[PDB]
Design a protein around this ligand. Structure first.
Ligand code: HEC
Ligand code: HEC
Lengths: 129, 129
């Protein structure tokens, strides 16, 4: 068992998502002009998102749908699809990290959008309203 | 500013340390025989620790020594020493990541020990008792 209690796995996955969101949202703000675009900071943010996208899945242990969590129970009865959506987030995030090595803003925006689709798509199905 | 409020910066750096501890402790348990050693998991842990070690510094914004934190105000009056300690944690994490590419248990333990000193060394000076 990777966690002592269900409440440690919830906090772990919640912390992971939160930190990913902080780094993802900064890339969104730079791409929308809410804050100046910076190639080096954007690349750091993309690296952080790629790495942090590999953390939360470990936290979705059996029985951790009870408690102070927004995870829906259907996650575990459809864990194969949930797992697939998490792998595709990782893949998309690795692609955004690659796009940050290029100077093509089309590419950055496109791979960013694909990653944003992954956050959104999973929340729509597997996160409480 | 990267954070709207000081409390968001505290929560960010605390989450990063929290995820780091979970990953660092799993490596400790494997190196101490508290749980089966797994080279593939161990390497993932080492990768996770190195990536996570690059995150918390951003959360140490000025004025965030007040709030729901265990950080000492001293961090800000000795910020370059604190920063140097964070970089050395990154250095040691990178060496632990490299060591994880080998099967030399002694080198694994030494590398793990070197990271452990960094955690403890900084806590001893800059985290409340
Ligand atoms: C399923 C395959 C997901 C992917 C892809 C993404 N997220 Fe998500 N997120 C998911 C769940 C099931 C939960 C609830 C966790 C819980 O135990 O309550 C979340 C939660 C978040 C949160 C809130 C975390 C918190 O502080 O409580 C955030 C900010 C968040 N998720 C962001 C986020 C982003 C930015 C993503 C794309 C980079 C993303 N998630 C993908 C499920 C899934
Ligand atoms: C200084 C350069 C540090 C290094 C190196 C490490 N840690 Fe630390 N940690 C530091 C501070 C100043 C704080 C308090 C932050 C706050 O605002 O309260 C912490 C906190 C932690 C915690 C508690 C996190 C929480 O849930 O509130 C943990 C579990 C932790 N740190 C673990 C940890 C590990 C495993 C480290 C080595 C890999 C490590 N820290 C290094 C300062 C510094």
């Amino acid at each position: 068992s990777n966690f002592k209690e269900a409440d440690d796995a919830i906090h772990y996955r919640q912390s992971a998502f939160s930190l990913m969101a902080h780094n993802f949202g900064d890339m969104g703000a730079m791409l929308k002009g809410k804050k100046p675009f910076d190639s080096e900071i954007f690349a750091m943010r993309a690296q952080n998102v790629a790495a942090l996208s590999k953390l939360p899945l470990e936290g979705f242990i059996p029985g951790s749908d009870q408690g102070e969590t927004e995870a829906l129970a259907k996650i575990w009865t459809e864990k194969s699809d949930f797992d697939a959506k998490m792998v595709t987030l990782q893949d998309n995030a690795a692609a955004l990290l690659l796009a940050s090595a290029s100077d093509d803003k089309k590419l950055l925006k496109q791979s960013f959008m694909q990653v944003a689709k992954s956050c959104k798509g999973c929340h729509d199905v597997y996160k409480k309203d």
